[model samples]
Target chain A: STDLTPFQIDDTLKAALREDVHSEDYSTNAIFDHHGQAKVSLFAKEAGVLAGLTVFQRVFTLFDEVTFQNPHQFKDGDRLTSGDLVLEIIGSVRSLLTCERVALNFLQHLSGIASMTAAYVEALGDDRIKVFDTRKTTPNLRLFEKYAVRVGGGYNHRFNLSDAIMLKDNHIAAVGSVQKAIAQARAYAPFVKMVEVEVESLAAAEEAAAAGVDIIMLDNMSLEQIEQAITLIAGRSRIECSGNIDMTTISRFRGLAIDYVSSGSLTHSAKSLDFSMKGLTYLD
Target chain B: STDLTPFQIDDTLKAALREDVHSEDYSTNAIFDHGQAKVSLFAKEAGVLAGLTVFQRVFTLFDEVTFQNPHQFKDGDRLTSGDLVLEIIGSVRSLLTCERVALNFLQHLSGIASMTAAYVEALGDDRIKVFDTRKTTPNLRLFEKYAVRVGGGYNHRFNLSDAIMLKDNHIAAVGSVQKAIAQARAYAPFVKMVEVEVESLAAAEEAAAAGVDIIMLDNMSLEQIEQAITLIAGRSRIECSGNIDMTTISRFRGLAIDYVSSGSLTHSAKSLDFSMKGLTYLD
Candidate 1:
C-alpha cells in the first residue's frame, strides 16, 4: 500500500542494465524448457537501512516476465532489522535469477552508503555541525550516492567543480595566488553562486577571508590551527573541515562552530552490511 | 616489467568507460580550461592487490592518459595504508574520470583476493585447496575468477558448459544417485569428470559405490562426514561445503577432502577501502 516510486534514475542505470543482460541468461536458457512462474522474495539477512527498492523493482520490470508486487509498507529510508521482509514478486524463475545479482548489488551497495552515513550522524550527537559527502563516489553513480547520503541524514558538499567556485591549493597554484584566483572567479562566476577557498595554514585562511570569500575550508588542519582560523576569520566566512576525517576523530570536533565535516569514506569506503537474496524454493 | 596482460579486455573495458564517461563529464569539461595534470594512486588499506592490468588498460584506451611511474608492486603483493602504488600524468578530465574505474577494480578484485587469502591461510595446509564457485558479478567472471587465483584459491567450472555436476535435485529427478551419475556420464564426454553431491552418509556410500569421480558433502554433520570418508575408502575424491566459516574451516582441513568450496569468498567479500587524493596540480 505504498505509492513510492524510484528516485529519478539516470542514463547510467539504463546503460548498466544493457551491459548486464545482453541476449539472455545462457545458463538459465540452456536448462529450462518451460519457465515456470516462481515466487520471488527479496529479504534482508542483516540489520540496516532499506534502499534501492525502486531500482530493485526496475530490474524485473525491465523484462516482462516478472510482475512486480507486494512492497508492503517499507520505503528506502525505513530502518530494517535482520530477517525483515523487503519485497516480494511473482515471475519466471529464469527472469528472477537473471535480475538477482545486479538487483542485489545495487541494493546492498547503496544501503551500505546509507548505513555508514547514519553511523556518522548518530556519533555527532548534536545538530550544530553537519556531515557531507565528497566527490569520492563510484564513477557512474555520483548522483546515486548523493541521494543515499541524504537518505542517511547527511548533505552533499558539491556535486562537482561547477556546483560551487572552490579555490583549493591546487587551483590557487593554477592561478597566481589565492587572492588572484578569488578575484578571477568573482568576475566570471554568477553573483548568486558562492565562492569558497580551501587553505591549511592560518595565514592563507586569513587571506581568503580578507578577500571576502563566502566559505573557508580547513584542509587537514589541527584543532589548534582550526581555532586560530576561526578567530582570524571573525565570522567573515563560514568554515568547513576536510581531509583524513574518519569515524574516530570526527565526533571530537562536535562543539566547534563549523558548518560541515566532509569525508570520502562516506561513499568510497563504506563497509557493506552482509545480505543475501534467495528464491524461497524451501517455502515453495 | 610485468607483461601479464589479460586475454580479452577490450570490450568489457570499453563498455565500462562508455557507461562512465557517457556523452560528457559535464563537471570536468566545464571547469577545466585545458586537460594536462599530474596525479598519484595510493593504498588506503592493506590487502592482496589486484586490477592493475585493468587500470593500465583504461590509460591505453584513453590515449590522453599516461602512466608516469613504474608501479611499486605487482598485483598480488600485500600493501598497507600510506603506500604509494603508482603515479600518472595526463588530461585532468580523463584522469579524474578514470580514477573511479581504476579504483573500483583495485578495490573490488583486491577485496575478493583479500577474503580468499584469509580462507587459504585459515585452512593452513597445502594439500587441501580452496575452490571458488561461479557466484560472480554479472559480466565479470574472467576478472573475478582471476582475482581468486591471485589470492591463492583455485577456480571451479568457468560456466554451465564446463563440467557435469549432479545435485540433490538432479539425483532426485533421476530416481537415485546411481541413476543420475550413470545418465550424466553416459551423456558427457569421457574427458569431462562427473561429480555427484550427496547430503547424507547413505547417499555418500551410494555415490562412492556408483563410482563417481568426485563426491561433494553438502551440509552434512561432521560426525557423518568422517564416517562417510571412511566408507568411501579412498575410492572418490572429496569436496566439503555447507555453512563453512573461518572459525569452523579448520575442521575441514587435514582430511582426505581435496577441495573446499565456498560462495562467501566471492559473493560476500568486503570492498577494500580506497580513497583517491589529488596532489600537486600544475595547470
Candidate 2:
C-alpha cells in the first residue's frame, strides 16, 4: 500500500549490506565456493502477515542474479503460517548465504511491523476510526518502517517535519496560544493546506477548532476531557486521540466520534516476527 | 559504559535535524521572534536515564539555537517522577524546531535503558546477566546497545563480524552442528567466539562436544532446557534465548546460566514517559 522507489529501497539496502558485509563474510567465503549454485527456501516460523518480499529479493540481486522459483508468491500483504514457503531462490552460494541475515532482517522485521499493524487494525474492528503511526520511529528506518506499517494496513502520520505542519504542546506554548500557533503555521506553510494541533485541554481544543485547524489531536487527555473537547469542536476538525494508547487500551475509544488514533507502539514497540531460510540444498 | 565521539553524535543528530527541518520549521519560523526562552525537561515516571547529552546536543545543530543555562542529567542516572532533568535557554523558534526530535531520541533510548534495567532487577541475581540481541533497529544498534549498557545489560554481537553464531539454518546448510563449528573455527579468527543455536539435547550435546564457545538453548521447554544444561555440563557458556521477555526472564534466575538474551529490549521497549513543562521566554 506504501510506494517506495527503487532508489529509496536500494540505498538503505546497500548500506545494510555494507554494515553486514564490511570486509568479508569469512564463514561463507571460506566455506562455500563462489561459483557454486545453491537452492534455498524461505519459511515462516509463525502465523502472520508477510511483507517486504521485494526488499528481500533486492538484497540478493545486489550481490548476484537470483531466480525466484515462485515469484508470484512475493506479494507484500499475504498471510503466512508456520512451514509456509515464502519464496524459493536459486543463486550463487555466497550471495545466497552471505545475504541471508540482511535479507531475513528486512523480511522478518517489516513483516513483524506489518503483522502488528494488521492486529491493531483488526482490534479497532470499526473501519471508521483508522489506526496510524507516529513520528516516534527508529532513526534512518522511518522509511521502511512506515512502509511496513502501511503494508500491515496502518496510515502514516508524516514522513518528517516538512511533510506536514503539526503543532504540539511545546510549539503551542512557545507561540503563546493554540490559535496564534496554527495561524502562524498556516501562514508560513500555505503550501501545506492542512495543519494539526495537539491539545491537552478543552479550551485549547476549542481554540484550535476556532482557528480552523485541519486536525485536533487530543493528546493524553482524560476520557471526560476528550468527550467534552470533541463536543466543543463539533466536527470542525478531524479528531485524533493519542497518549499511551496500545492494543490493550485502544478499544476504550471505540464508540467515540474520533477519526484517527495514532500510537508509537505500532512502530517503536512492535514484536519482530520470526522467519528463516530453510531447506537449503546445493543445486550444483 | 557507552562511548560515542562528538562526530558520531553530531552526525546522526544533524541527519535527524534535516529529517525534522527539511526546509524550515514553519510554525516556529512564522510565529516567534529571534528571542530566547527557558524550557525544562521533567520525568513523568521513574526510570533509568539515557540520551540526555544527545538531547542537549539537538539544539547545537541549529544556528539560531544556543543551549545555555543548561542543567542536565548524565546517562544511567535513576530518575523519578517530577525530576527536573534539564533547563535550557535558546531561541523560541530553534527550541520548538528541535524539541520533538530531541525528545524522540531521549524518550526512545531512555525507554530501552529503563526496560533493560527493569529486566536486570527482575532477575535479581548477580550470577546471571541480561543481554540484547542483533534484532536491533538497523543503524541504531550502537545507540540501543549503549542504552542497554546504561541499564546494566550486556550486549551480544554487534554485527555479523562480531562473532560466529551458527543458527539452525547455518547448521542445516553446512550439514550439521559439528561441521559448522569446525568450519567456523577454521575460517574465523581464533579469538572470535563460536556460538551455536540448538533446540534439542542431541544438538546441544553435538555443539558442546564440538567445543563451541557458547550454546544458545533457543526456544526449548523448561524440562528440555534443564536436560540440555546437564548435557552441556558447562563445557560451553549457556545463553537462554527465544521468547524471553520481562515476564519469563525471572524463571531462569536460579538456573546456572551465563546470560539471557532478549530481542524485546530493543524491539519492544516502551518509551519512558516524559514531558516538557515550564516554558518561560527569556527577557
Candidate 3:
C-alpha cells in the first residue's frame, strides 16, 4: 500500500544528495581508482520491516548510473531479519560509498517507523480496531513517515491540520464550549467528512457526543476513565483513545470498545534499524 | 557557532506552511471576527530554548505587514516553566491558524537542543567535544544540526563531502586501512583531513601507520579502545563512538579521546514540551 514512485521521491533524494554531498565526496572520489564499477551487498544487521527501497536505490542513481542485483528480493512492508541480504548494487564505487549513509538514512528511518507501527498494531491484538499515527512527525518528512505508518498496518490520523478538523482542548476553550466549536466547524466546513473532538473528561465526552460530533477522542484518560467515557458515550459517536500510548502500555487497550487508538510514538519515537553496506568489490 | 541564515531556513518554513494550510484554515477563518488579537507563548514546561526566529516567522508568513512580535528570549536561551517566551499581536484568524505549526517547530527544535544540552552536561569535559551524526531526521538535518550546536555540541561533517571519513565499509571496499588512507590522500586535497573508523586494535595500528588524521574507535569495548589508543600513541586524533550516551558516557570521561559522536543525540532525542495557553482577542 505504501508505494513510493520515483517522481514522488526524487526531489527529496536530490536535496538530500545536495545536503550531504556539497561539492563532492572527497573520501569516496579519492578512495576509488579510476571510474571503476563495484559490487556491494547491503545487509540488515538487525531485523525490520523493509520500506524506502525505491528511495534507497534512487539515492545512488542521482549520483551516477546504477543497478540493483536483486530487485525482487524485497519491497516495503516485507519482514526482514539479521543477516538478510537486503539488496546488491553494481555501480561506480564512488557512488556506492558516497551515497551509502544518506541511502541508509532513509531506509533505516522509514523502516524504523514501519517496524514500530507494526509492533504497536501487534500489541493491540485486535483487527476490528485500528492504530493511528499522530502529527508528531519530523516537519518536512511527514509524507514518507505516514507512508511507513501504512506499511506497518497502521492508519494515519491526518496529514496535517488541513486534512481534517480536530477540535482539541484549546479549540474548545477558545470557542467557549464543545457545542459552539462543533457548530462553528460544521457551519464553516460543511463538506468536511469527519469532525473529531478530543475530550479529557466524562462531561466533555458527553457534550461532544450529544453535540453530534462524528468522532470523540478520549485524550490521556486512565483505563478506568476510558471505560467510563465509553459507557457514557454509549456508541453515539465513534470513539478513539489517544495520548501517551506506547509499546509497553498499548496492550492494555486491546479488546477495548474503541474504533481507533492513536499515538505520537510511531514516527517521533521509533529507533532506527541497524543496516550496513559492506563487502564492496570491483566488478570487471 | 551554527548561524542559520534566512536562505537556509525559509524554504523549510514555506513548505511547512503549505503542508499545514492547504487551501485555507477553515476553522480559524470561520470562528473569528475580522479583528486583531494578542497571544503569549508560555513555557508549559522547562527546557533549553530554540527556534524563536522560526516560531515567529510562522505568523509573519500569514500576514507580513500586520504581525507584531516582541520577546526577550532567543534561540539557545534556557526556558523556565511558566516563563512567557514571547508575545504576538496579529489578525486573530492568523494567530489561531498559525499557533500549532509555530509551536510544533519551536517544541521539536527545543527538544533536540535540550537533549543535546543534557548529554553535554553529562560528559562534563571541554577537551573531548561531542559531535552529532548524520542520523538526523530526514529533511530536517540542517535545523537539527543547528540545535545540536545550540546545545554546545560540535557538528560532524554536514554531508559526506565535508570531510573524508573512511568507515568500516569504506575500508573494506578498498581492501584495508592502509589502502583506504593511501587512496584518500591521493584523491583529496592536501589540506583536507582524513578520518578512518576502526573497530580493532590491528586496524588502529595500521591507520596510525598509514598517517590518518583521525581514528574513530567505533563500537569497540572500553578495554579494546584503551588498547587501541595506546597503540596509536598519539599518531592520530581520537574519536569514540557507538552506543555512547549520558548513562554510559561516565566510563569514557577523562579518556584521552578528542571527540565522542553519538547518533542518538539527534535520532533518538526526546522532544521537549511547550504550549500556548493565554489568548486575548483585541477588537
Candidate 4:
C-alpha cells in the first residue's frame, strides 16, 4: 500500500545513472535495418503485476529521443492481463533497435518476477502477510532484479553479505548449535544490529527462541505445526516461513501470523515476458 | 619472443589478480569443490596460436596433490592446422568445472588476440592492422579487451566518443583544413586522444606533415605510403594503409608504423571460448 517514488527508495540505485547505454547482446538489432524506422509495442504475454517501467523507459531514453507512450499505466504492484500494452515507442531505427533488447530484457524479467510474486502474495490470502525476494539473482544484474521485485509489490532482502546477519545451517553446524552461532555473530557484529537464525524443528526453534534472536526462519514446517509454533512464539521473536513456499501453500500460512515469507523462486524461476517492435513510417 | 616458463607467467598474472571473481556467482568452496581432485583440458577446434597457458595451469595447482597436464603445448604465434590438440586434463569434476569457465574464458580470449597480433606483426605492410574483439562481452569486459590491444596489437577507438574524430564531412564543412583538427582538440577532453584520416598523397603528407595527430592513411598504395612517410619526416605519428588482409601485413609491419586500426572488434568478432556446468556429479 506504499506509494513510494524512485527517489524515496535506496540511494545505491540512484547513483548508477549514466548516459552511456550498453548491452551484451543486440540480437534484435541484427534483424532490422539501421536506417528504417520501426515502431515497437511492449506487451505482457502472461498475467502478473508490473514493475520496472521507469527503468525500461530510462534505458531507452538514454539512447534516443523516442516518443514513449504508456497506454496501460499501473503502479508497481498493480496486476495486468495478457496482451496488455505496457509501453509504446517511435524513434530512429538504429537507436530503437539498439535499446530494444536491454529494454525488453528488464521489462520482461521484472514482470515475470512480479507475476510470480503476485501468485505468492495471493497465496498469503491475508492482507497482513508479506513476501520478500532474496539476493539469489543472475550475476551483475542483482541490483536491477531486486529493484524489480520491490516494484512487483514484494519486499527486498539484504542487498549483499554486509547488509545483514543471517545464520544458516552451515553457520549452526560450524558453531556446534544455534545458541553458540548467535553468540559468536553478536560478538562480531554491532550491538544494535539484528541477527537472524534458521531452524528446522521445534527443538532448534526452542533453542533459537530462548537465545533471543531477532528473526527465526521456521524452515519447512507443515501448516499445523507452523500454527502451533506461531502460538508458542506469541510475539517472542519475528517469525519467517521458509523452504519450498509457493502459490499453493502461501495463503494457508497467512492466519498463522508470520512476519515475512521469503521466496528465492521469485527471481530464479521467473520467465521473461514477451515483447516486440512495430515500425512506424517517418516523414523526410 | 620471450621464452618464459609457466611458473613465471603464473606469478605475473597472480600478482595482478584483483576482485575479478564475482562473489554471488562463485565461492572458494564452489571453485575448489570443497577439497577434491580436478583436471582441465584445451582442444583446438581450429588451427591458431595460443597464449595464457601458463596462467591457466596456476588455478589447477592451487590445491595440493591435484594433478595437472596439457596435451597440446604450442608456442605463442605458431600456426597450426585444424586438427591440432592443445591441452588435456583429468581431475574431480567439481574443482575442474569450477575453474574451467574462468580459465577457458581467459585463454580463448587471449588466444584470439594472440592470433590477431601475429597477423599484425607479419603484415610488415604498416598501414592496415587488426584490432581486439569487443563483442560478446559482459560489462567491465573492456579491460581484458584493452589488454589484448596493449599486448602488441593496436586499439580500435575505445568507445563511441573516440570513433567520431575524423568523419569525412567534418573536414569538408570547415573551410580551413586545420580548423577541424583544432575543433576536435578543443571539444575533446585532455584524456580523449584523436586520430585524423587522410586519403591521397597531398592529404596524407599534409596530415603527417602538419603536426595534427595520428595520421591514418586510408587505402593509400603501399608505394605512395613509403614516399609519404619520408615526406612527413617524423613530423606527425603515422599509421599506414586501410582494410588489411593477413597476408599483406608482414610488409606493413616492416614499414615500422605506429598503429593499424580496424573495425573488426565490433563488426566481425566471435565469442571467446568458455562454458560452465554444475559440479554435483563430480562430488
Please state the error at residue A42 of candidate 4 in Å: 2.8
* Cα shift from native, residue B172, model 2 (Å): 3.1
By lDDT, the better pick of 2 and 4 is 2
Question: B92, model 2: CA deviation in Å?
Answer: 1.7
For each candidate, what is the lDDT? Answer: 0.72, 0.81, 0.82, 0.54
Which residue pairs come into collision in candidate 3? none
Q: How big is the positional error of residue B21 in model 1, measured in Å on the Cα after superposition?
A: 6.0
The candidate, 1 or 2, that scores higher on lDDT is 2
Better of 1 and 3 by DockQ: 3
Name the top DockQ candidate.
3
Rank by lDDT, descending? 3, 2, 1, 4
Per-residue accuracy of model 2 over A25-98 as CA lDDT, tens digit each:
76566556667778998888998998788888888998788888885455888888898888898988778878
User: What TM-score, to 2 decimal places, does chain A of model 3 have?
Assistant: 0.96
Q: How far is candidate 1 from the true structure (C-alpha RMSD, Å)?
A: 5.0
By TM-score, the candidates rank as 3, 2, 1, 4
Fnat (0 to 1) per candidate:
0.08, 0.43, 0.51, 0.00
Q: What does DockQ give for each predicted structure?
A: 0.20, 0.49, 0.55, 0.02
lDDT for model 3 comes to: 0.82
